[PDB]
Amino acid sequence: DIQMTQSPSSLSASVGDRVTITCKASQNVRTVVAWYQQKPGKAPKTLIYLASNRHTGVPSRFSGSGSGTDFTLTISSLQPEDFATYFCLQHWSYPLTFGQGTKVEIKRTVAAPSVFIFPPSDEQLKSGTASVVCLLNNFYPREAKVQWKVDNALQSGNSQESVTEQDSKDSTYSLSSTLTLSKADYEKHKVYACEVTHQGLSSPVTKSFNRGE
């Protein structure tokens, strides 16, 4: 079996910049290596065949090169369409093996999250479960910390985070943090807050509510 190792796993870059992704094979595979592009939620698009040839419809900025065990994808000038995940493949021998991929994302400037909190709606409460949702909107870079305090007591283990893909208009992320609770244990407690730490925030932010408001 031939292993295909991509580097780096991810990379940030800005429009017009020049990026280089590398792949390493555990064995000699001559020039029998291809490269594929995938945007989130979408089917792949084939880019490069036999190490260095553009497939049909692939623009000039893309170029591959390499031989034996050392292969390279080069994009000469990232455009918006080029932010995506790229895979290498060896088909010298079965099994055909892909690399783990390198995710390529847009570098932009710091933007601080707009923070919002949502108590469980009356329709949900009328059903025996409570969901408190903390929304973080349109921020960069992706790293963010969100903590829950219920009557000034810190929670651990009972919240779930989800994060959107880099948005296509402004290149930000958004995040949901959902505190999941029984209708019972949720009404035992009185003040709900989530605290957001983010590099673009001068101070950590808190948004609170009291149950009965």
* Residues lying near another protein in the complex (CB under 8 A): 34, 36, 38, 43-46, 49-50, 53, 55, 87, 89, 91, 94-101, 114, 116, 118, 120-121, 123-124, 127, 129, 131, 133, 135, 137-138, 160-164, 169, 174, 176, 178, 180
**Residue 36 or 71 with smaller CB distance to another protein:** 36
Q: Could you tell me which residues come within 8 angstroms of residue 4 by beta carbon, excluding any fewer than 6 positions away?
A: 23, 24, 25, 26, 88, 89, 90, 97, 98, 99
**Residue 16 or 169 with smaller CB distance to another protein:** 169
Q: Shortest gap between Cβ of 122 and another protein (angstroms)?
A: 9
**Residue 77 or 178 with smaller CB distance to another protein:** 178
**Residue 78 or 103 with smaller CB distance to another protein:** 103
Q: Say how many C-beta atoms besides its own lie within 10 A of residue 17's C-beta.
A: 13
Q: Say how many C-beta atoms besides its own lie within 10 A of residue 43's C-beta.
A: 6
Q: Report the sign of the C-alpha dihedral through residues 102, 106, 109, 114, in that order.
A: negative
Q: Shortest gap between Cβ of 170 and another protein (angstroms)?
A: 10
Q: Shortest gap between Cβ of 115 and another protein (angstroms)?
A: 9
Q: Shortest gap between Cβ of 42 and another protein (angstroms)?
A: 9
CA 149/CA 168 separation, integer angstroms: 33
Give helix then strand counts, H and E, for the chain.
2, 19
List, in sequence order, the alpha helices (H) in the chain.
122-125, 183-188
**Residue 17 or 50 with smaller CB distance to another protein:** 50
